Amino acid sequence: GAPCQVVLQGAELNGILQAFAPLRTSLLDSLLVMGDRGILIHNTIFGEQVFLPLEHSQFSRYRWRGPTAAFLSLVDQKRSLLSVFRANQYPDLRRVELAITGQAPFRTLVQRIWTTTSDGEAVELASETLMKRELTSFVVLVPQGTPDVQLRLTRPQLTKVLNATGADSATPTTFELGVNGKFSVFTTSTCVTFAARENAKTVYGENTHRTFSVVVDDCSMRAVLRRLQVGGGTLKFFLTTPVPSLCVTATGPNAVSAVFLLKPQK
Amino acid sequence: TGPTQRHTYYSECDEFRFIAPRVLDEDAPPEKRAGVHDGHLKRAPKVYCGGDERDVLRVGSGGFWPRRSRLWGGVDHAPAGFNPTVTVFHVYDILENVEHAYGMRAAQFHARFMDAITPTGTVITLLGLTPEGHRVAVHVYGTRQYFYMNKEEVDRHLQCRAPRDLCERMAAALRESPGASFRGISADHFEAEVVERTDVYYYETRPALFYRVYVRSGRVLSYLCDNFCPAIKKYEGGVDATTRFILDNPGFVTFGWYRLKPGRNNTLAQPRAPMAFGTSSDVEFNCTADNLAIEGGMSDLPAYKLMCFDIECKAGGEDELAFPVAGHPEDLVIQISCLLYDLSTTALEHVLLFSLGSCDLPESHLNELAARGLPTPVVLEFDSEFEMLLAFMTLVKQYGPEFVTGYNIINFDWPFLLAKLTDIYKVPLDGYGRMNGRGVFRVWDIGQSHFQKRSKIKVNGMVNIDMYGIITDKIKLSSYKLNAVAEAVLKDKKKDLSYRDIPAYYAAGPAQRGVIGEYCIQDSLLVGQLFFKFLPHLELSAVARLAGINITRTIYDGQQIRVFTCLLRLADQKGFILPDTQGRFGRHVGYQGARVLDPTSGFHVNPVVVFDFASLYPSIIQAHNLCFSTLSLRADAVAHLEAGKDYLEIEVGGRRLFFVKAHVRESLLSILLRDWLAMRKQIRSRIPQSSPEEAVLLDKQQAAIKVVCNSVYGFTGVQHGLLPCLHVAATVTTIGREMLLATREYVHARWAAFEQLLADFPEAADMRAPGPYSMRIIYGDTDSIFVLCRGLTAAGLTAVGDKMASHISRALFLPPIKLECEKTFTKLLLIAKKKYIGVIYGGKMLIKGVDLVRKNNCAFINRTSRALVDLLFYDDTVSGAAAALAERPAEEWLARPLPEGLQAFGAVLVDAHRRITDPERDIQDFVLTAELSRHPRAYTNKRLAHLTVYYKLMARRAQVPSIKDRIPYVIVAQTREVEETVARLAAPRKLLVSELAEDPAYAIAHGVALNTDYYFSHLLGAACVTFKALFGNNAKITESLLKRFIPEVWHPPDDVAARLRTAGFGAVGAGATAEETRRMLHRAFDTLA
DNA sequence: CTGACCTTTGTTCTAATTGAGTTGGTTGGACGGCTGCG
DNA sequence: CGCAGCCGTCCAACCAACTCAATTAGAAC
Ligand SMILES: Nc1ncnc2c1ncn2[C@H]1C[C@H](O)[C@@H](COP(=O)(O)OP(=O)(O)OP(=O)(O)O)O1
């Protein structure tokens, strides 16, 4: 019974919620994808890609079987299975469970929810039981490979780098890491700088050896990074591809990540 | 000298407007082939036929079409010594005209007739045929119209002192009219007598003295009613002279067999001399009503002739492919088909094709016609439009068809013809009916008028029956194009020719003009088959006889006039007169109607018995003696009668009303109903001996007579009608409401336990099914209740139901009220008020109210919905699973998989979602329709799909729909060209449904794509509203559960992929092997985290 | 001794569509308070 | 001890969803 089971007992639940609390009804509408390795949540925000990898490590019991499965988070296109992890959607939550059943396409997922009610006991939040069917086919496009460079922006200097970005669509913006490791992010109007090393000027870094400068045409970057309450985060760069990209992930053991397409401006 | 009155039709013509296509000049230059000639030409109009040539207006030996005409111009063409004896004749039509003695000096009329029209009088002309096939007109002298006014009132107001004074004061009023159109009117043009009568309106109304005033002209009567002494109430001033003739001579009829007889002092009918004939007839007679009697024995029709005709038109302007408009000189009638039938025999006798330009019918068409034993077509060839149209009208006059039919001839064919004949050529139409001049020949469109139910045609002696009218009343279809009707009713596919195709066929030469000819002939042959299936003239003449009105009014002039004329017959012979009270003329209802019980929605798998009252509202009028004449609004009126024994007292709309019982005074409405109820019985009496096709025809005739009986109730309910009485109407509905509730309470008291039922019906014992016994009303509308009979078997409930109905009826109500047991369901889906689907104990499926049987919806969604219904009702696995859903509250199914037996139900929806996307989709399956209910300007909400399509058609100069036509449309996908178009014409906007509507022909021609999202959401919509009843009537839950059947799919957009592929290989799921899938997910997590 | 034209059975009901108004929720910006650093 | 910056809280704005009303088609009776 239930060939696939995934469980979040209280010991592990807070491991998810600590990553999910910064999310404020921002990720509620998302695709799920499942295999042996855990859950991947995915959504587009203001026209740019966001991902949350929830590794099977973060779970108290886990089993996967057969091919990967994918599900949209909404039910009735109104309620959502991700709701459990939002703020105090429910005041208490002793555990939550995903179970997947059936075969090939047309597998059936149920999400089951239990709450402490004092009295030394927990009971089903039965009316809130969610039932969703695997989508028959999907394409999802997901990132790969080792990043070229990483910078570890703590919350204050993340905020400064973020505030220095432009707006609308006309205005330019560029990320830089030049020789001596200045991390001199700038626009034609505004400029900042941070001392990359492989006092409060410094950004701790990896693979900073490689030096570059690159513009971004993407609007709303900061809007996305606020919707997500980004409590600081590492920036890691992908530069070997014919179109480069910058991935921003929150600082922590598990994190939401957002991937921004850079210009192929060499 | 010539005839006593001038003939106004053309018998000679030396000069005319010549208009014809230049492409008929076969040896003209290519540059000269376009457009039309238009100029005057001085020669006699000609016709060509088979190498021979004749003048159109000549009568003699070698004619090209048949003739039933005696006179032509002033010449007589009967053989010498022609003089048939007339005894019996059949009348099909009646005319009213005014004759003046001075205009008739030279006609050798006997003195008795001259006295009746001195100085002027109305003459009533019976039109008909002898059993030897001679056309006859009998002119009846001596009928006068009249009205009444209260004597005391008239005396007070005018200070009159003798009847002669009132005649002098009326003559004064006429003389002093503005326009002075009554010169010469004198007191002797009027006669006034004092009589005793009673106003028909309430029981306590006393008889009084009235002047009855005879008038020699209806034009005079009209003026007096409108304008003379407006403070004084007038009675029966709206009754025409025909009605006076029919009602004052008991037994006389507007359709049927008469004979001539000696009259009051042994007077005899006088034969007219041919130069004194008023009409196109073989023989004419002058007589008075004393010289006529009805012939009871004779019932068969004589050898009347029916013409079935169709026209074809060619636009001639710069856009060859615009629809033709009759007011444009260059948009011409090019062909007319004309088929002549003997109505006594059903046989087709002639097939005539009129053709502008030469026309050679294809040999295949001729061989086909010969194989069916039909007459060989005669093709008549003309050089110009005028010559062809004159010829067609000449045929209509010289052959004189008593009946004329066609398909959509009232909206298109006759209007197009008459426009050309009136506006382009200046031909007077008043001589082209039966009369030789001064007769009616008109069409009335609906137009801007708020009132008119329909368009109408009147041609003075000619019964027009448009089969488009007939068919729309008898078969329910989304389209009424003739090919769709032919498929549905006659069961054969005609090929069809579009107006876009005709201009290219026409220009190609004689053979292709022959192809057009074949299409016209085939069309006319189909219309003939439809005519002789439905036989409308027999149904219409039966009603005409009973109502006392002529057959043309029976076709066109509504229900109220039928009821009014019947009431007038009875009123007169009881001493009542009917007030006119109609000197003038809100949007809401006048009174409370029927009670509909709140349905116990659900799927019911126990037997359900339906009880319904036979002829409810008529039976209430009869049972409780309801009438104008039996009503009182005062208690002092009934003070001398005994309560309950002599009168009903009833509260109706917050007033205490009283209706006297039949032993105190019979209801005129009660008596009126007897004939119509009898007529309906006589039809239904014939159903069980009739064939499977006859039975369907008889059922529709039956239902039309029911409409007349119910319109007697309706008549009383018409604010601003001919004789309103909202007290009577509201009483009927009140009593109906009481009876419905009484019937429910009876059933719930009498048979609560099986013991009680077995005590009333000992046969019940064999009928007991295993569970608990219950009998409970789960629904009912107006005059029927639905009793759920769990614990009893369907097999016996039919028999037991008849006995229950009898019992209830005899317990509760007064005859003629009869509750009947109509049918038993074995399964029933009560969806909502007026919406349910069920299976009758035989196996037959019945469907009421749901979109599956409404004409608006497309064939794709209908066929799919029918498939879902068939699974619920006839698949045991599905029916069982559907019955299981009721064991849980509806919302519990949101959190649980459904009973497994609903597999096939879900499979039908997934197939529909597949098929709807296929490129080989037939657009015709996606056509929606709505009626244009009114003139497009009269709509308040203007954002409607059918109105969108209406204006598009108008701007593209396509055929514009008529009012009351159904308009087909499809919903197109919003490609950006749509946003551009609609924004441009009006002034991320998601367009409304009404802005995506489009003509199906345009959408085909321009390869426009259908809106798959609209159609599939509308399909789920239909399913949802029909199956909410299986889930507690909750539409939101039903919608959600139905969506769980559908295959969901998700992808990134195309350009989004075109970017992302550059960096980040999305092999997740489809697009890679399961191995590559797990590989890429591993590849991704470990770098994204 | 001469002209004409308006018409015409009832009420009850569901559902789709369109348009307007209301309600709720979430996010973003500004201002104040508290803590840390000079 | 004073000033400046950062964080938290409250209020307003903006956008979407739902509700209600009126019109219309079209049926059932
Ligand atoms: N077209 C209508 N116009 C006016 N009233 C109508 C019409 N149809 C039905 N009604 C009213 C009056 C009817 O007496 C009543 C019940 O109708 P219904 O049962 O359909 O027919 P009926 O009882 O008059 O004849 P029968 O039951 O034999 O068919 O509803």
Ligand SMILES: [Mg+2]
């Ligand atoms: Mg036609």
Ligand SMILES: [Mg+2]
């Ligand atoms: Mg009935």
